[PDB]
């Protein structure tokens, strides 16, 4: 169907007839076939009156009768509904991105498989969803498999359905807050559907109940209770019996098999065995009116046409969604506290609970989506409270926001509020609480998630942590030379589609793809090879970012002389405190700031001698890194005339340390004294630069050198009964437990721990084994950690790393000692 913008804004008003949901299915169980079936039947498309985007959500439109509308155990308005099909990841390892998509939904269509049933991953996703208080509704897909492959029987088939329905409710029952209620599924209640995404058909007990009801007078409520379980209609006797063995002890067929499975089973038998005589009368019985062409169809061809006219799989899926899934009004009432990070009595939490469109804004940005509108990204999220309007002055509260501080806060104006119709957007003036909307003009203020509020009081909403630090990289080359041009373009596309990936050319002439972790890199490398570039790619082992630091002050004074022999430099190196290194990294200790102001900050807050601070010559690397060069020289003739070179030499030395070429971190350098030649002609960079270089490299190795490793902060949701499996893995990997807290309703524990990045490879696989896929991981780079080993001792833990690197870089295995940068004098 196609709607103007006014139609949409109308549907959006009646938030009671909206349904925000996602499809929780195994990519291998026909997850997309169904979604396609839905869209093909009810998807919406502005009827209008060239910017494209990455489809993140689709709007569906469904209409029902007044009779059905009365069955909704929920406050509804109108017989029209707007369903929001929000997309979700295809791989469960994506954990963090799953939680995002899920967090903006209130119900889910969980697809289970006929034969295989409830697989492990799907059970995990479902557990998360339930953890979030999302109401499930199930569909047993791929029934055509059991019919065609195994050539099973009606009762067999039935029992499979039955057992599987059990599996699910055991989960749903264990992990469903006592707040949700008996959110367990039942075929007779109309919350379980059956069908085949392939052949495109599907049904619910209810649809057949409505059928046999009219053409036979009886009521449906009763009828659909008999269409499942042990209720029997004996033909001969023409009466219903609750006894499975009737008459003279003969077995009777279960109602489900007799009125639902039998009719279908008869179409599969007739059609595939080409029983030309039957098929025509049969179709007549059920009322399958073939249209011209089709009449000459046969085999799987004809089947995929008959089954469609008979039980339009879509119609059955929409039934459940409308009739059983919660509206924003219903859901937010109990999903509020979990989503609000502040007081459960706050004015905002109350507004979310009441889905109040008059309250201040509370908009949850779950993700940023690539667009064609230049390099822009649009915000995708849900308005939980208030209304968002174009040009609206909004408080953009990023991940590191706190109600008290001013950090990560941005007060800008939303350029435009638009509807996210698949790959198409449609501007709109405003959007009230309860709706899934998009936003233009927040690119430069949010990278992935965030909270948009109007109250200066409002806390953030349960955010999802994500780092932008490229702690891991890999080299990638093409297999077939000629494909090169495609890679170059691919890498450029990869970069445009992801604010955390990074592609570039290395000095060794290699294509580099740096990412956030093994997880992230895996995704990119695939999308690169199959979509972005679409060509066979050669990939190298992962390389982990490291840092070079000093543990103490210099043994002795560093000294070096230009090649001239006419210049010398005297400096010493010492540790820069983490507190201060972070300070530098967080902007607090800024390079542009007033050296006087800056200096005061380092003095009053970081016990720094206000003088030295006033004498910082520069930061490093790139001019802002967490490394300094403090001036402590007394009466030096022409000092200012070599500042540059000294600074330059610092930039070079801090980007490539002397241990194995990595950036330095937390390194302080105090120039003690300088003896320059009198003639400017002999104090040039060619002379100086190398001097301050060796001198810095020298004093570094004299200050008890060490390397730092990036450490992840992993957070795992998991059954209290299996937490043991977690700890088990963490120990086998230098892990360290930070917290282990529980949330009151569910048997679901959450464990937070630090895990070195160099230990994280394969962590997900090993973690699901140790817990039977019951653990749900997610990591974010957190900090740097100094290894206590000796980087120079090839046998130590540190030196083991240092060596593999130098070799990899084709350097000389041994690490040049300071003596080789020192000049005796």
């Amino acid at each position: 169907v196609a709607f103007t913008v006014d139609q949409m804004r109308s549907l959006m008003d009646k938030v009671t007839n909206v349904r925000n949901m996602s499809v929780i299915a195994h990519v291998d169980h026909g997850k997309s076939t169904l979604t396609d079936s839905l869209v093909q039947r009810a998807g919406i498309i502005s009827a209008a009156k060239g910017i494209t985007i990455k489809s993140t959500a689709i709007s569906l439109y469904s209409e029902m009768s007044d009779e059905d509308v009365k069955e909704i155990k929920q406050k509804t308005d109108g017989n029209s509904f707007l369903i929001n099909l929000i997309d979700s990841p295809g791989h469960v390892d994506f954990s963090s991105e799953v939680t995002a998509a899920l967090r903006v939904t209130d119900g889910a269509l969980v697809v289970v498989d006929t034969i295989e049933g409830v697989c492990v991953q799907t059970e995990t996703v479902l557990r998360q969803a339930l953890g979030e208080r999302i109401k499930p509704v199930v569909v047993i897909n791929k029934v055509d498999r059991a019919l065609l492959e195994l050539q099973v029987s009606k009762e067999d088939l039935y029992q499979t359905f039955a057992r599987t329905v059990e599996s699910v409710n055991v989960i749903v029952s264990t992990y469903a807050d006592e707040v949700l209620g008996d959110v367990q599924v039942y075929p007779a209640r109309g919350t379980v559907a059956f069908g085949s995404g392939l052949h495109g058909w599907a049904f619910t007990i209810r649809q057949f109940a409505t059928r046999y009801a009219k053409k036979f007078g009886v009521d449906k409520a009763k009828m659909m209770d008999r269409l499942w379980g042990d209720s029997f209609f004996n033909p001969k006797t023409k009466k219903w019996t609750n006894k499975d063995t009737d008459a003279e002890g003969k077995p009777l067929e279960r109602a489900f098999n007799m009125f639902i499975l039998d009719p279908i089973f008869r179409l599969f038998t007739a059609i595939m065995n080409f029983k030309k005589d039957e098929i025509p009368v049969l179709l007549e019985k059920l009322e399958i009116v073939l249209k011209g062409d089709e009449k000459d169809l046969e085999g799987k061809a004809l089947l995929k046409v008959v089954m469609r006219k008979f039980l339009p799989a879509a119609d059955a899926l929409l039934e459940m969604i409308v009739l059983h899934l919660p509206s924003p009004v219903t859901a937010q009432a109990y999903r509020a506290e979990q989503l609000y990070e502040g007081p459960a009595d706050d004015a905002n939490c109350i507004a979310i609970k009441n889905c109040d469109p008059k309250a201040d804004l509370m908009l949850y940005v779950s993700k940023m989506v690539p667009t064609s509108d230049k390099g822009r990204f649009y915000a995708f999220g849900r308005v939980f409270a208030g209304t968002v309007k174009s040009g609206q002055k909004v408080r953009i509260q990023g991940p590191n926001y706190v109600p008290g501080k001013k950090d990560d806060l941005f007060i800008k104006a939303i350029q435009r509020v638009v509807l996210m119709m698949g790959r198409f957007v449609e501007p709109i003036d405003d959007c009230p609480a309860g709706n899934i909307i998009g936003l233009v003009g927040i690119d430069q203020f949010l990278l992935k998630t965030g909270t948009l509020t109007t109250s200066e009081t409002a806390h953030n909403m349960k955010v999802m942590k994500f780092s932008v630090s490229p702690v891991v990289q890999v080299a990638v080359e093409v297999k077939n030379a000629n494909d090169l041009p495609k890679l170059v373009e691919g890498l450029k596309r990869l970069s445009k589609s992801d604010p955390c990936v990074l592609t570039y050319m290395s000095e060794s002439g290699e294509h580099i793809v740096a990412g956030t972790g093994e997880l992230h890199l895996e995704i990119c490398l695939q999308d690169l090879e199959h979509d972005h570039a679409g060509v066979p790619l050669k990939i190298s082992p992962p390389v982990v970012a490291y840092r070079e630091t000093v543990e103490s002050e210099s043994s002795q004074t560093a000294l070096s002389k230009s090649p001239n022999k006419h210049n010398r430099i005297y400096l010493k190196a010492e540790p820069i405190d983490e507190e201060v290194s972070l300070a530098i990294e967080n902007g607090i200790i800024n390079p542009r700031d007033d050296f006087k102001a800056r200096a005061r900050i380092m003095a009053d807050d970081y016990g720094w001698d206000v003088t030295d601070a006033r004498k910082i010559w520069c930061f490093g690397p790139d001019g802002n890194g967490p490394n300094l060069v403090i001036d402590q020289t007394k009466a030096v003739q022409y000092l200012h005339e070599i500042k540059d070179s000294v600074v330059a030499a610092f930039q070079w030395a801090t980007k490539e340390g002397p241990i194995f070429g990595e950036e330095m971190r937390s390194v302080r350098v105090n120039i003690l004294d300088v003896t320059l030649h009198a003639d400017a002609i002999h104090r040039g960079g060619g002379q100086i630069i190398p001097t301050m270089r060796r001198a810095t490299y020298a004093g570094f190795l004299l200050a008890d050198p060490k390397i730092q490793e990036p450490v992840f902060l992993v957070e795992i949701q998991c059954p209290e009964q299996a937490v043991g499996g977690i700890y088990s893995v963490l120990n086998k990997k230098r892990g360290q437990v930070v917290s282990e807290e529980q949330r009151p309703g569910t048997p679901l524990f959450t464990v937070k721990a630090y895990l070195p990045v160099n230990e994280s490879f394969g962590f997900t696989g090993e973690l699901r084994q140790a817990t039977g896929g019951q653990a749900f991981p997610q990591m974010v780079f957190d900090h740097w950690s100094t290894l206590g080993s000796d980087p120079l001792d090839p046998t130590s833990k540190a030196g083991e790393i240092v060596l593999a690197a130098r070799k990899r870089h084709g350097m000389k295995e041994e690490v040049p000692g300071w003596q080789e940068y020192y000049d005796k004098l």
Side-chain angles (χ1 to χ4, degrees):
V1 69
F3 297 150
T4 59
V5 173
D6 302 299
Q7 280 168 284
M8 289 303 280
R9 186 63 184 72
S10 176
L11 273 306
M12 298 164 79
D13 265 350
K14 305 182 178 181
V15 168
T16 53
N17 297 47
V18 175
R19 295 277 189 288
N20 302 324
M21 41 80 67
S22 53
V23 184
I24 296 182
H26 190 302
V27 289
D28 269 314
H29 294 177
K31 182 182 177 178
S32 55
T33 321
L34 298 191
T35 352
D36 295 308
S37 175
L38 283 165
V39 186
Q40 287 183 292
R41 172 85 183 72
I44 302 174
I45 300 165
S46 94
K49 186 165 189 195
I51 296 184
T52 65
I53 62 177
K54 178 185 176 182
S55 166
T56 309
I58 298 184
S59 300
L60 272 46
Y61 171 84
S62 190
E63 276 193 302
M64 310 230 129
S65 72
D66 298 65
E67 299 306 298
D68 311 315
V69 172
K70 299 181 181 185
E71 293 176 59
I72 300 162
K73 330 299 178 195
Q74 180 173 51
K75 180 178 295 184
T76 46
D77 172 326
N79 295 314
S80 283
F81 298 98
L82 167 61
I83 320 185
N84 279 154
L85 195 49
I86 295 182
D87 199 43
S88 60
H91 320 318
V92 177
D93 290 294
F94 279 121
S95 44
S96 62
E97 188 42 61
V98 182
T99 302
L102 289 185
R103 193 154 296 176
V104 292
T105 66
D106 303 313
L109 179 55
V110 171
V111 178
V112 163
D113 183 60
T114 298
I115 305 180
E116 301 169 290
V118 191
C119 86
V120 199
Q121 92 166 189
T122 296
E123 179 188 302
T124 312
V125 181
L126 177 57
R127 202 205 311 291
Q128 266 313 85
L130 286 161
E132 301 269 300
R133 306 208 182 189
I134 297 176
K135 184 176 185 175
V137 99
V138 178
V139 167
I140 302 178
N141 182 48
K142 292 177 66 180
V143 177
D144 50 330
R145 185 177 178 189
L147 296 183
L148 299 182
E149 279 176 48
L150 314 187
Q151 182 53 65
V152 82
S153 78
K154 293 187 285 183
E155 179 69 1
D156 291 326
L157 176 50
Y158 168 75
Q159 284 308 333
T160 301
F161 289 164
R163 302 186 304 260
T164 290
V165 173
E166 233 305 59
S167 284
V168 178
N169 291 304
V170 171
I171 296 167
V172 175
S173 54
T174 316
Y175 303 100
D177 312 54
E178 304 192 300
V179 190
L180 278 183
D182 176 40
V183 76
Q184 293 194 294
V185 300
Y186 299 109
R189 303 295 191 177
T191 54
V192 182
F194 306 94
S196 160
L198 182 59
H199 297 63
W201 59 269
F203 65 82
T204 69
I205 293 295
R206 187 175 180 294
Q207 286 171 309
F208 266 110
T210 303
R211 186 188 300 286
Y212 184 81
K214 173 170 294 178
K215 184 182 179 179
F216 285 95
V218 189
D219 85 81
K220 64 171 60 175
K222 192 72 188 65
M223 195 50 202
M224 41 182 98
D225 270 335
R226 288 176 180 171
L227 289 173
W228 187 271
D230 304 312
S231 301
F232 310 79
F233 179 67
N234 191 308
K236 302 179 182 179
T237 69
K238 299 186 66 179
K239 299 192 172 188
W240 292 84
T241 308
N242 27 9
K243 194 180 164 76
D244 74 40
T245 156
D246 216 55
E248 203 62 54
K250 304 309 173 184
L252 290 188
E253 179 177 60
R254 174 188 310 300
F256 188 68
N257 307 39
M258 164 177 285
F259 299 108
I260 296 173
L261 296 175
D262 176 81
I264 291 170
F265 267 58
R266 284 199 185 299
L267 292 176
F268 268 67
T269 287
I271 289 177
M272 305 308 226
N273 292 53
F274 298 99
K275 302 297 180 180
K276 290 173 285 296
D277 299 302
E278 312 178 303
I279 300 186
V281 187
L282 191 48
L283 268 50
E284 181 167 294
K285 295 187 63 181
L286 305 175
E287 295 181 302
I288 307 298
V289 184
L290 285 183
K291 301 281 188 173
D293 308 302
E294 312 179 305
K295 288 193 171 186
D296 289 55
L297 276 171
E298 295 176 57
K300 304 167 190 174
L302 175 59
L303 194 48
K304 288 181 180 175
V305 180
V306 182
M307 288 297 86
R308 282 183 180 285
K309 291 206 61 176
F310 188 34
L311 314 177
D315 288 319
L317 290 173
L318 294 165
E319 189 189 75
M320 298 194 303
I321 293 175
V322 168
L323 298 170
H324 295 294
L325 287 179
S327 78
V329 184
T330 291
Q332 301 196 189
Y334 59 76
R335 223 152 81 66
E337 314 182 317
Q338 291 183 298
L339 298 177
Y340 193 40
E341 289 199 306
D345 50 80
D346 193 62
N348 299 91
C349 202
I350 293 292
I352 291 175
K353 298 186 187 180
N354 303 312
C355 201
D356 201 353
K358 300 299 179 59
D360 291 317
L361 190 66
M362 285 302 294
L363 192 148
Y364 178 73
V365 178
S366 63
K367 64 161 66 178
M368 294 300 286
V369 56
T371 76
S372 77
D373 172 22
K374 298 302 78 186
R376 295 306 187 169
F377 277 112
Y378 284 5
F380 172 66
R382 174 175 174 185
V383 180
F384 270 109
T387 70
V388 63
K389 335 158 189 166
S390 298
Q392 176 174 45
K393 180 190 166 215
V394 123
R395 289 167 73 73
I396 294 173
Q397 320 192 328
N400 291 299
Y401 180 75
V402 173
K405 310 178 181 180
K406 218 288 183 181
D407 306 292
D408 219 322
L409 174 52
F410 301 94
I411 297 180
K412 326 299 296 192
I414 292 181
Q415 177 166 8
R416 174 68 81 166
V417 170
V418 303
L419 310 175
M420 307 282 263
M421 324 269 284
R423 312 191 309 100
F424 306 107
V425 295
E426 193 70 64
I428 210 184
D429 300 332
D430 49 60
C431 182
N435 288 84
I436 263 66
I437 206 69
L439 302 177
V440 195
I442 306 307
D443 282 82
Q444 303 148 307
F445 307 119
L446 282 176
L447 296 181
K448 296 188 172 170
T449 21
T451 309
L452 267 47
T453 72
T454 274
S455 174
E456 304 201 308
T457 290
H459 292 56
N460 283 314
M461 287 186 83
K462 203 176 181 186
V463 292
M464 311 128 48
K465 305 173 185 174
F466 61 84
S467 55
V468 53
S469 307
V471 303
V472 175
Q473 58 161 55
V474 300
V476 180
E477 307 299 296
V478 293
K479 288 182 173 179
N480 321 297
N482 304 303
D483 292 302
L484 189 162
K486 293 175 184 176
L487 183 51
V488 187
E489 179 60 53
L491 300 170
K492 288 176 187 178
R493 291 172 176 174
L494 173 56
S495 303
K496 287 187 177 182
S497 60
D498 188 334
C500 296
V501 70
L502 213 59
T503 65
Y504 67 79
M505 179 64 39
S506 56
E507 299 188 306
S508 42
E510 286 172 283
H511 297 299
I512 301 304
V513 182
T516 310
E518 176 171 63
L519 188 54
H520 174 57
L521 230 54
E522 248 270 296
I523 318 308
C524 296
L525 288 170
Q526 295 178 296
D527 293 30
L528 181 62
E529 183 171 56
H530 303 302
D531 294 301
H532 299 295
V535 152
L537 295 172
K538 179 184 174 187
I539 303 179
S540 74
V543 163
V544 174
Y546 287 106
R547 244 52 149 184
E548 294 187 19
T549 193
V550 299
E551 200 71 291
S552 63
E553 189 188 305
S554 297
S555 307
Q556 46 180 286
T557 297
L559 174 48
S560 303
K561 63 175 176 179
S562 57
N564 252 330
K565 297 280 195 177
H566 306 312
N567 307 73
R568 287 192 183 58
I569 293 179
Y570 302 85
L571 61 74
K572 262 191 292 181
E574 74 184 300
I576 286 182
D577 308 276
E578 256 293 288
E579 259 292 65
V580 176
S581 287
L582 279 349
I584 300 178
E585 287 161 338
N586 294 309
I588 283 57
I589 308 302
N590 189 303
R592 291 156 293 178
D593 200 359
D594 183 59
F595 81 88
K596 299 193 175 182
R598 183 180 62 211
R600 166 167 164 158
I601 308 179
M602 291 182 265
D604 310 318
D605 304 312
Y606 302 103
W608 255 70
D609 178 285
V610 55
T611 280
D612 302 329
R614 283 179 183 291
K615 287 198 176 181
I616 304 176
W617 262 17
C618 68
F619 289 51
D622 307 317
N624 68 293
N627 295 78
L628 305 171
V629 179
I630 296 75
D631 181 344
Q632 299 178 321
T633 41
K634 193 185 170 188
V636 175
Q637 266 275 292
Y638 322 127
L639 191 71
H640 65 294
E641 289 184 301
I642 61 168
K643 176 163 184 172
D644 293 344
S645 301
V646 167
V647 175
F650 193 60
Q651 302 311 301
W652 204 293
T654 54
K655 182 74 157 185
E656 306 184 310
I659 299 182
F660 68 105
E662 282 261 42
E663 287 175 43
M664 300 186 149
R665 186 162 178 292
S666 304
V667 183
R668 173 168 172 175
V669 171
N670 298 178
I671 304 170
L672 307 175
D673 189 55
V674 184
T675 61
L676 303 171
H677 183 294
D679 287 303
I681 276 180
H682 296 311
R683 309 190 308 267
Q687 287 305 326
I688 303 303
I689 299 182
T691 309
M692 169 65 163
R693 178 88 68 79
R694 297 191 296 96
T696 303
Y697 273 14
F700 180 92
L701 282 15
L702 286 171
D704 187 27
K706 273 165 180 168
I707 72 179
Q708 310 193 306
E709 65 180 331
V711 186
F712 276 148
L713 156 46
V714 61
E715 177 187 303
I716 313 174
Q717 274 67 54
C718 155
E720 169 171 39
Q721 56 186 298
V723 181
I726 291 186
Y727 293 108
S728 177
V729 183
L730 297 185
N731 298 309
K732 297 174 190 175
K733 300 183 183 302
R734 295 195 294 136
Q736 166 184 169
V737 179
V738 176
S739 72
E740 172 210 298
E741 59 200 358
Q742 191 167 324
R743 288 172 72 183
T746 75
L748 205 59
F749 259 128
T750 165
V751 186
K752 290 189 180 180
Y754 292 135
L755 162 62
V757 178
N758 50 47
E759 302 286 338
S760 74
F761 294 104
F763 181 82
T764 304
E766 285 189 42
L767 176 57
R768 75 180 30 145
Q769 189 72 65
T771 55
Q774 279 209 291
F776 204 61
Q778 52 182 61
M779 330 173 301
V780 57
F781 162 83
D782 186 286
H783 59 66
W784 285 101
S785 176
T786 299
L787 298 169
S789 335
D790 180 82
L792 310 93
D793 175 6
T795 70
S796 61
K797 288 169 168 295
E800 235 171 65
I801 298 169
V802 171
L803 193 58
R806 308 182 110 289
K807 294 193 185 181
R808 194 177 74 246
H809 287 318
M811 306 181 87
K812 176 187 170 181
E813 309 194 13
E814 308 84 300
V815 176
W818 60 269
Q819 294 93 195
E820 281 156 65
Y821 302 91
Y822 198 60
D823 294 308
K824 304 302 170 186
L825 159 148

